[PDB]
Design an enzyme around this catalytic site. Structure first.
Site, PDB file in Angstrom:
ATOM      1  N   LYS A  49     -31.480   4.453  -5.076  1.00 47.40           N
ATOM      2  CA  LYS A  49     -30.421   3.901  -5.644  1.00 47.40           C
ATOM      3  C   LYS A  49     -29.173   4.997  -5.304  1.00 47.40           C
ATOM      4  O   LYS A  49     -29.239   6.257  -5.434  1.00 47.40           O
ATOM      5  CB  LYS A  49     -30.569   4.221  -7.140  1.00 47.40           C
ATOM      6  CG  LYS A  49     -29.307   3.707  -7.862  1.00 47.40           C
ATOM      7  CD  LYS A  49     -29.806   3.169  -9.327  1.00 47.40           C
ATOM      8  CE  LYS A  49     -30.338   1.612  -9.242  1.00 47.40           C
ATOM      9  NZ  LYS A  49     -30.592   1.154 -10.637  1.00 47.40           N
ATOM     10  N   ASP A 143     -30.148   2.101 -22.874  1.00 39.98           N
ATOM     11  CA  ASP A 143     -29.738   0.809 -22.153  1.00 39.98           C
ATOM     12  C   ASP A 143     -30.797  -0.194 -21.677  1.00 39.98           C
ATOM     13  O   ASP A 143     -30.694  -0.483 -20.493  1.00 39.98           O
ATOM     14  CB  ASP A 143     -28.851   0.975 -21.231  1.00 39.98           C
ATOM     15  CG  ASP A 143     -27.662   0.405 -20.592  1.00 39.98           C
ATOM     16  OD1 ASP A 143     -27.076  -0.264 -21.751  1.00 39.98           O
ATOM     17  OD2 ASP A 143     -27.099   0.182 -19.683  1.00 39.98           O
ATOM     18  N   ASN A 442     -13.024 -39.617 -13.221  1.00 40.73           N
ATOM     19  CA  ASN A 442     -13.125 -40.979 -14.137  1.00 40.73           C
ATOM     20  C   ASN A 442     -13.245 -40.562 -15.491  1.00 40.73           C
ATOM     21  O   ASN A 442     -13.744 -41.303 -16.293  1.00 40.73           O
ATOM     22  CB  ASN A 442     -14.379 -41.440 -13.595  1.00 40.73           C
TER      23      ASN A 442
HETATM   24  C1  LIG Z   1     -33.618  -5.227  -7.560  1.00 45.85           C
HETATM   25  C2  LIG Z   1     -33.065  -3.590  -7.386  1.00 45.85           C
HETATM   26  C3  LIG Z   1     -31.779  -3.567  -8.124  1.00 45.85           C
HETATM   27  C4  LIG Z   1     -32.719  -3.748  -5.829  1.00 45.85           C
HETATM   28  N1  LIG Z   1     -33.859  -2.500  -7.818  1.00 45.85           N
HETATM   29  N2  LIG Z   1     -33.558  -2.053  -8.673  1.00 45.85           N
HETATM   30  C5  LIG Z   1     -34.753  -0.998  -8.811  1.00 45.85           C
HETATM   31  C6  LIG Z   1     -34.460   0.190  -9.802  1.00 45.85           C
HETATM   32  C7  LIG Z   1     -34.151   1.365  -9.586  1.00 45.85           C
HETATM   33  C8  LIG Z   1     -33.740   2.064 -10.857  1.00 45.85           C
HETATM   34  C9  LIG Z   1     -33.455   3.548 -10.607  1.00 45.85           C
HETATM   35  C10 LIG Z   1     -33.509   4.061  -9.285  1.00 45.85           C
HETATM   36  C11 LIG Z   1     -34.016   3.443  -8.361  1.00 45.85           C
HETATM   37 BR1  LIG Z   1     -33.982   4.190  -6.583  1.00 45.85          BR
HETATM   38  C12 LIG Z   1     -34.125   2.055  -8.303  1.00 45.85           C
HETATM   39  C13 LIG Z   1     -35.530  -1.083  -7.864  1.00 45.85           C
HETATM   40  C14 LIG Z   1     -36.492  -0.565  -7.555  1.00 45.85           C
HETATM   41  N3  LIG Z   1     -37.082   0.538  -8.481  1.00 45.85           N
HETATM   42  N4  LIG Z   1     -37.476  -0.996  -6.611  1.00 45.85           N
HETATM   43  C15 LIG Z   1     -37.024  -2.224  -5.773  1.00 45.85           C
HETATM   44  N5  LIG Z   1     -35.790  -2.704  -6.148  1.00 45.85           N
HETATM   45  C16 LIG Z   1     -35.196  -2.364  -7.326  1.00 45.85           C
END
Ligand SMILES: CC(C)(C)n1nc(Cc2cccc(Br)c2)c2c(N)ncnc21
Ligand SMILES: [Mg+2]
EC number: 2.7.11.1
Length: 462
Positions: A49, A143, A442
């Site tokens: 992320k 949250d 319509n």
């Molecule tokens: C669907 C998408 C939004 C692409 N997503 N979100 C997260 C959650 C997430 C939450 C905090 C840190 C991280 Br890396 C990942 C996550 C994940 N953990 N693994 C794959 N996709 C993910």
């Protein structure tokens, strides 16, 4: 907003912390985008992320965040997202987690043929088990939304994965379905671990009925009922729902956090212990509630993209004007990228990941144009295709949201459902009604998808 889900960046060779190579964008979550990345050395795949320091402020100091991360790294639970590592550069915070190919919870539910009471019990049990474990280790989510509840795989072996746990305590921005699940404890600033129980109680209510306890076609309307705390079971769905289930909901949706039930007591409740031991619910209401939110945000993103793309087009034209010194209108592939970067510098904000998205943006537009092999492109044609492509992407997202909305419909949208959609989009009632007149010829009171899109376009024009 130049990074879209599914888009590959492995040709760009983007490396995070000199060990994580970016490969594919999985999408966007809270506080930032998620990127599928492979370890440079081992080859492990991870989800990263990417939170940027300019867009998202930090509510705590640097010492407290590091201590929180070190705590989250040693925590392991089947229903909790694993956090491997935290690091940072000049532009971004990075969080390394596992890759979950499952997707959101409410999405998988409304993709199923039907939904049962036993199903909702198994789902809630996994959620509460995860919340219980994190609470025992003094960690609060604060949250908790259905967006933050994913699945590990595409199964059936359903495994719930709670994400973004503890991130809200340290991060804040500097979507549309958030007011439903937020606890009054948070709204008053005096919150504890009991707020996660409230959020889970709301989800359970929705899982059983397909309707929010505190509803409304507007954030202000929703938050007012949350502040009041007044909900009811006066629905046709709860007529067949067990009293045990209603008793659990009552205990989870207590306004006073001290009186409100804990996570472990809820996990050991009579309803869960009976339903998950060794009656089919309204899946239509869940589908209606979820798709309405998805179609509404798809409508906002459509109008948002069209309006945003126009202003940058007018901005890129000015920049390209000062680069076209011979006035022939043709610019280089390199000069086009520079223009995009000068747009950012004049806004204050580049990063290597950002530079990768720009190149991808430019190339994808050039791949849509029959390129002259002299190496030069008409920038007016470039920007024209740029507009059409973004419009095309916005329609495809609108088509997918409408597909979900119209799974068992007449192929049209009512006049009431428009009020719910544009209500969540904060669009004035006088606005979309005037446009509905021009769209509905319509005077049926109902319109198809093409006519719905025409409304969104005319709304950008009013
Ligand atoms: C669907 C998408 C939004 C692409 N997503 N979100 C997260 C959650 C997430 C939450 C905090 C840190 C991280 Br890396 C990942 C996550 C994940 N953990 N693994 C794959 N996709 C993910
Ligand atoms: Mg020129």
């Amino acid at each position: 907003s130049k990074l879209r889900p599914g888009m590959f960046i492995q040709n760009s060779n983007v490396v995070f912390n000199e060990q994580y190579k970016g490969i594919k964008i999985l999408g966007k979550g809270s506080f930032g985008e998620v990127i599928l990345s492979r370890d440079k050395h081992t080859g492990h795949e991870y989800a990263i992320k990417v939170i940027s320091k300019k867009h998202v402020k930090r509510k705590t100091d640097k010492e407290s965040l590091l201590r929180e991360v070190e705590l989250l790294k040693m925590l392991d639970h089947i229903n909790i997202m694993k956090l491997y590592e935290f690091f940072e550069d000049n532009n971004y915070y990075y969080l390394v987690s596992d890759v979950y190919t499952g997707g959101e919870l409410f999405d998988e539910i409304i993709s199923r043929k039907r939904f049962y009471e036993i199903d909702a019990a198994r789902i809630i049990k996994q959620i509460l088990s995860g919340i219980t474990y994190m609470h025992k280790n003094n960690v609060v989510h604060r949250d908790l939304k259905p967006e933050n509840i994913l699945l590990e795989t595409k199964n059936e072996d359903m495994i719930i994965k709670i994400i973004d746990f503890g991130l809200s305590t340290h991060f804040e921005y500097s979507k549309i379905g958030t007011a439903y699940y937020i606890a009054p404890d948070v709204l008053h600033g005096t919150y504890d671990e009991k707020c996660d129980i409230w959020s889970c109680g709301v989800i359970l209510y929705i899982l059983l009925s397909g309707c929010p306890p505190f509803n409304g076609s507007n954030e202000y309307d929703i938050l007012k009922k949350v502040e009041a705390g007044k909900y009811t079971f006066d629905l046709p769905q709860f007529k067949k729902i067990s009293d045990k289930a209603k008793d659990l909901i009552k205990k989870m949706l207590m306004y006073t956090s001290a009186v409100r039930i804990s996570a472990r007591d809820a996990l050991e409740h009579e309803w869960i212990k009976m339903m998950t031991s060794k009656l089919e619910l309204s899946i239509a209401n869940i589908r209606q509630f979820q798709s309405t939110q998805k179609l509404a945000q798809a409508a906002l993103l459509y109008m948002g993209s069209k309006l945003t793309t126009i202003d940058e087009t007018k901005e890129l034209t000015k920049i390209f004007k000062k680069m076209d010194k011979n006035g022939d209108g043709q610019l280089d592939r390199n000069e086009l990228i520079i223009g995009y970067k000068e747009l950012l510098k004049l806004k204050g904000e580049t990063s290597d990941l950002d530079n990768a998205a720009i190149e991808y943006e430019v190339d994808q537009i050039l791949n849509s144009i029959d390129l002259d092999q002299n190496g030069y492109i008409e920038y007016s044609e470039f920007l024209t295709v740029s507009i059409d492509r973004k419009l095309l992407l916005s329609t495809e997202r609108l088509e997918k949201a409408f597909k979900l909305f119209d799974k068992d419909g007449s192929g049209k949208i009512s006049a009431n459902e428009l009020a719910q959609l544009f209500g969540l989009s904060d669009v004035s009632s006088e606005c979309w009604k005037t446009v509905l007149k021009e769209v509905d010829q319509n005077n049926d009171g109902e319109i198809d998808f093409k006519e719905f899109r025409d409304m969104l376009v005319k709304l950008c024009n009013y």
